[PDB]
Amino acid sequence: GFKQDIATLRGDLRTYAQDIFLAFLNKYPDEKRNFKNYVGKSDQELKSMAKFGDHTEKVFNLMMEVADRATDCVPLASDASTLVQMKQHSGLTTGNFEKLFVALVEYMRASGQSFDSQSWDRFGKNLVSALSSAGMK
Ligand code: MNR
Ligand SMILES: Oc1ccc(Br)cc1
């Protein structure tokens, strides 16, 4: 289920993080408006860029911590507020996060592994709701 998935993702996190974020960028190309330095690059070229690998894994490091601290796929209010207040997120809206989690859920469903895709869909929706409650437009 959800908790086992966190362990599975953590056991190969740099690869999962990059592959999921690439799925997001490729499914939603306009989202590169927030990633100007990732424009004009193929998947393999992005994977060679130091900040791409390091930032994506750090993003997913924390996403797993937020998932791990959640109850029934509902994140803590303190984690949601952290995500709203981060300066790195100053320009973002809940739709940016919804699209990330649509891509994450589709990635899991296209994989051959028994990911609990339904719980990750709940987690993404519940995260969006917590982000809105904590002030994100
Ligand atoms: C589509 C937009 C974005 C979505 C969705 C998103 C969703 C999430 C998310 C999901 C639950 C988590 C956990 C998360 C966490 C982070 N995030 Mn976030 N994020 N996020 C950015 C846009 C987005 N984030 C940007 C832009 C930056 C800073 C620039 C960069 O590192 O390229 C950043 C930065 C970061 C960093 C700092 C990385 C460092 O400096 O190396 C963490 C940690
Ligand atoms: O550098 C970044 C990579 C992926 C996300 Br999601 C946010 C920032």
Automatic annotation (TrEMBL):
CDD domains for the chain: Mb-like (cd01040)
Keywords linked to the UniProt accession: Heme, Iron, Metal-binding, Oxidoreductase, Oxygen transport, Peroxidase, Transport
Gene Ontology molecular function terms on file: heme binding; metal ion binding; oxygen binding; oxygen carrier activity; peroxidase activity
Family named by the database record: Belongs to the globin family.
Positions with a binding annotation for heme b 3: 55, 89
UniProt keyword annotation of Cell membrane present: no
Entry-linked InterPro entries: Globin, Globin-like_sf, Globin/Proto, Mb-like_M
List of residues binding heme b 2: 89
Originating species: Amphitrite ornata
Binding site for heme b 12: 89
UniProt binding sites for heme b 5: 37, 89
Positions with a binding annotation for heme b 8: 55, 89
Positions of heme b 1 binding: 55, 89
Keyword rRNA-binding tagged: no
Top-rank taxon: Eukaryota
Protein residues bound to heme b 9: 55, 89
Identification of the protein by name: Dehaloperoxidase B
Residue ranges annotated for the Globin domain, each copy included: 1-136
Binding-site residues, heme b 10: 58, 89
Residues reported in the UniProt entry to bind heme b 6: 51, 55, 89
Binding residue positions for heme b 4: 36, 55, 89
Residues engaged in binding heme b 11: 88-89, 97
Binding positions (heme b 7): 55, 58, 88-89
